[PDB]
Design a protein around this ligand. Structure first.
Ligand SMILES: CC(C)C[C@H](N)C(=O)NS(=O)(=O)OC[C@H]1OC[C@@H](CCCn2cc(-c3ccc(OC(F)(F)F)cc3)nn2)[C@H](O)[C@@H]1O
Ligand SMILES: [Mg+2]
Ligand SMILES: [Zn+2]
Length: 846
């Protein structure tokens, strides 16, 4: 054994040992219990970043832990390869997105392998290969003919300078993010998944997920946004019907989740597109401009609640069907056409948004709910105003005294008998638009024929192959400019026809890849029945919290779609979910020509016992230290993991990632932290080397520990309590820094114990054999190497250390007490119950 720890001399040999034994290449073997541990697969962007290393180390710790506990562990990796990065890189560098993608995959794969992740590379997938995306085209066609996928005109933001469609997030003050040109709202035909048909299943099945964080489930419930409410129709006043047609001349229909407060409505609000808004605006230029501003907005959903709420009165009035009050109709910017009736009622006394709106415009507020003897003040909002559980109706005529639910049914009865309303269930959830006006994505398998309509491509003809010999230019979607691609024959009639040129939302690839891993070479379906039956669901899923809403909802949706097609038998794709935080780092800059700053990478900086100023490495001139935030290209504060691997090895990188913070926490990049991790690995190496240099390996202590010395019994207690702590950390708490600190405490106590005797060496052997197996999920290369110096058996066959319960029992007390012959540590306790015979009796002489 070499005296000093040198990761470059051991880490490649360990990887070759694991690869040779094929420990990570698993099959559908019903002889060992399966465990499917999955980390969210990456975009092949070019190189790994620190978020990748954190994520896939966490996954590897859990996988190797289950491996050592005897599970048949699948840990697959692959590449989420479609999307805009490759298109951007294509325009910047004049290379094909496919070629750029495949180069990145090869480089990143090498990086992953060098980190020693126990990955089944025989299950690798690349979602931009036709062998992958043919199966989501297939599923698309199946759902399209069922109507679960449909085609419908929708509104997009068109950038006329960049000649491309922009998400609301790419619109700033009505202008494209890069071009700066005013965007144009355009109606175009697009394809949609009818995810609203599955809204109740997706909401209710969340309750099955007892091993999901409550916040993720809460966020999905809020996103689905089910409400049980009331349709209410307010008759339009006889003086307010000019310009209105149909039922819009007769009534204004609204949806409310608080019909118990209907007696307290003081106005109503309609969307900019509502026929009442149109009719009132016909001769009022201020309303026309207000409607035009609402339509021109591009507010992202995560920002909808933060936008300033504004409205205009219309001069039109409706009648409250309960109390007869004549209420003025406002146009408001928070009322969205397409949600419900595009019209709401306002109760400023019991809805905070209505309160602020009414306060802005001095609109009335009528209290109709009371909670105890609390004071109602129309000038200041109190939280109890919105209370639904503990409230009673007031100022509501014959409804006074009722609680929420009884008032709800009473209002339902009253409205239903009048014909003015009825209970109704709504969902905030929108259907899933999947059309993308981009090249580097899965072609939509539809052919347009003037005789036959939108025709799905038959299954024998799939895939529709995206041509890879393309270099996007930035003057429109390439596929729309390629007749060699879109000109075709109709598969129903053989006539002249045109392929769909839009591609799929790349969330589609990530909505089913975890099933594809089960049979990644199966050419007769999305996933073979034998492999889906064996692997079932993902036991452990690990990834960033930023995917808690959309990706997870889409994956749960695709699982239920695939279940309903008969391809799988699970209702839910992911049993346990571990969400990881972000990686942050200090930022550095040098001040600019024009009162700005230019940001310098941390590795290209060197700081100067208390550190002071930082300077550039190449020259030594000073740099400005700035704030700590998430690693990004924006402020040039990303630390390349390849440099961390180059400087210290894979094991140090993995150890620092796991010791620095729990998975959910932000992980701060720390030079001293990385050095601390490396020094601990040196220490572990030194401990085994010094142990072996003074006598070589012995049979580890096992069995009855009667006759062991007090000090060695104490070390065995620390040992098996550590094994218990670590197992509970990996298996239950999924907090790995405390598992590391626990082994550190074991090694500390070992360091303070004389293990030089025959029995001492056998306990030291037991200690070290456990410590390297406890740490092998985190730092497998050094532990694999050290284990082989301690013991000749296969480490993965020796398995996870077992807790010796006998080592955890205390030394016992048993003696008699006698005051005047009648029934320090023993004198102190029997006094709580001065002659004492050693160990047998005590006698309290008094
Ligand atoms: C399932 C599928 C939808 C997943 C999809 N293909 C995807 O998200 N793919 S992915 O490749 O983006 O991420 C693959 C996984 O692992 C990384 C996780 C990132 C956690 C947050 N986070 C980012 C960073 C960070 C960024 C840049 C840096 O470099 C710099 F820019 F140079 F600075 C340095 C650090 N730190 N922390 C991610 O959540 C996912 O679980
Ligand atoms: Mg259950
Ligand atoms: Zn046809």
């Amino acid at each position: 054994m070499q005296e000093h720890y040198q990761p470059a001399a051991i880490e490649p040999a360990a990887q070759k040992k694991w690869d040779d034994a094929r420990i990570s290449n698993v099959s559908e073997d019903a002889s060992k219990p399966k465990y499917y541990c999955l980390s969210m697969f990456p975009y092949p962007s070019g190189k790994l970043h620190m978020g990748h290393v954190r994520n896939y180390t966490i996954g590897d710790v859990l996988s190797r832990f289950k491996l050592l506990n005897g599970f048949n562990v699948m840990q697959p990796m692959g590449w989420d390869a479609f999307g805009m990065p490759a298109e951007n890189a294509a325009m910047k560098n004049n290379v094909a997105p496919a070629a750029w993608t495949y180069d990145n995959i090869e480089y990143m794969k090498t990086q992953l392998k060098s980190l020693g992740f126990a990955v089944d590379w025989e299950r690798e997938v690349a979602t931009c290969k036709p062998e992958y995306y043919r199966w989501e085209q297939w599923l698309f066609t199946k759902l399209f003919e069922k109507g679960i996928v449909y085609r419908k005109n929708g509104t997009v933001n068109w950038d006329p300078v960049d000649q491309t469609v922009l998400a609301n997030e790419q619109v700033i003050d009505g202008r494209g993010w890069r071009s700066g040109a005013l965007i144009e709202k355009r109606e175009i035909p697009m394809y949609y998944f009818k995810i609203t048909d599955y809204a109740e299943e997706l909401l209710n099945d969340l309750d099955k997920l007892e091993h999901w964080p409550e916040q993720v489930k809460t966020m999905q419930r809020n996103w689905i946004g089910k409400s049980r409410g009331m349709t209410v129709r307010f008759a339009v006043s006889d003086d307010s019907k000019q310009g209105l047609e149909g039922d819009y001349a007769k009534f204004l229909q609204v949806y409310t989740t608080r019909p118990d407060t209907l007696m307290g409505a003081t106005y109503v609000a309609v969307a900019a597109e509502h026929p009442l808004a149109t009719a009132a605006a016909a001769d009022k230029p201020e309303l026309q401009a207000f409607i035009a501003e609402c339509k021109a907005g591009s507010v992202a959903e995560a920002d909808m609640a933060t936008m300033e709420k504004k409205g205009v009165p219309t001069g039109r009035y409706v009648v409250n069907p309960l109390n007869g009050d004549k209420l003025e109709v406002w146009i408001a910017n928070y009322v969205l056409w397409g949600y419900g009736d595009g019209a709401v009622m306002a109760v400023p006394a019991h809805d905070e948004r209505d309160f602020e709106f009414a306060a802005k415009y001095n609109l009335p507020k009528k209290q109709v709910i009371a909670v105890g003897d609390n004071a109602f003040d129309a000038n200041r909002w109190q939280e109890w105003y919105g209370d639904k559980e503990n409230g009673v109706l007031v100022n509501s005529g014959d409804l006074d005294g009722l609680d929420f639910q009884t008032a709800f049914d009473a209002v339902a009865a009253k409205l239903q008998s009048q014909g003015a309303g009825e209970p109704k269930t709504q969902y905030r959830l929108r259907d899933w638009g999947i059309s993308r006006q981009r090249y580097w994505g899965c072609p939509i398998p539809i052919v347009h024929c003037e005789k036959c309509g939108n025709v799905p491509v038959p299954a024998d003809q799939l895939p529709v192959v995206l041509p890879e010999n393309v270099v996007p230019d930035g003057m429109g979607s390439p596929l729309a400019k390629m007749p060699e691609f879109y000109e075709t024959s109709c598969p129903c009639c053989g006539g002249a026809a045109k392929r769909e040129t839009d591609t799929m939302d790349t969330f589609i690839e990530s909505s089913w890849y975890f099933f594809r891993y089960m049979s990644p070479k199966f050419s007769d379906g999305m996933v073979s029945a034998e492999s889906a039956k064996y692997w079932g669901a993902v036991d452990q899923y690990i990834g960033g919290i930023e995917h808690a809403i959309l990706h997870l909802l889409y994956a749960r949706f695709f699982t239920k779609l695939m279940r309903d097609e008969g391809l799988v038998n699970v209702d839910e794709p992911f049993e346990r979910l571990l969400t990881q935080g972000m990686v942050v780092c200090e930022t550095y800059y040098r001040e600019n020509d024009k009162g700005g700053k230019d940001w310098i990478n941390p590795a290209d900086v060197e700081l100067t016992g208390r550190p002071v100023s930082a300077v550039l490495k190449a020259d030594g001139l000073p740099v400005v230290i700035s704030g700590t935030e998430k690693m990004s290209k924006s402020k040039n504060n990303g630390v390349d993991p390849q440099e961390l691997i180059n400087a210290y090895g894979a094991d140090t990188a993995r150890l620092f990632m796991m010791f620095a913070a729990p998975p959910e926490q932000s992980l701060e990049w720390s030079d001293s932290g990385v050095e601390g991790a490396h020094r601990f690995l040196r220490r572990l190496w030194r401990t085994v080397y010094e142990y072996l240099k003074q006598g070589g390996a012995v049979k580890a202590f096992a069995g009855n520990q009667d006759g062991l010395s007090k000090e060695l019994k104490d070390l065995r207690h620390k040992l098996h309590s550590t094994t218990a702590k670590v197992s509970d950390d990996y298996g239950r708490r999924q907090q790995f820094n405390t598992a590391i600190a626990a082994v550190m405490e074991l090694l500390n106590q070992y360091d303070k114990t004389d293990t030089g005797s025959e029995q001492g060496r056998a306990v030291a052997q037991e200690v070290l054999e456990a410590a390297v197996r406890l740490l092998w999920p985190i730092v497998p290369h050094i532990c694999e190497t050290l284990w082989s110096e301690l013991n000749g058996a296969k480490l993965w066959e020796a398995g996870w250390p077992t807790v010796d319960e006998a080592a955890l029992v205390k030394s016992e007390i048993e003696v008699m007490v006698q005051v005047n012959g009648k029934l320090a540590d023993l004198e102190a306790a029997a006094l709580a119950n001065i002659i004492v015979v050693p160990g047998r009796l005590v006698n309290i002489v008094v």
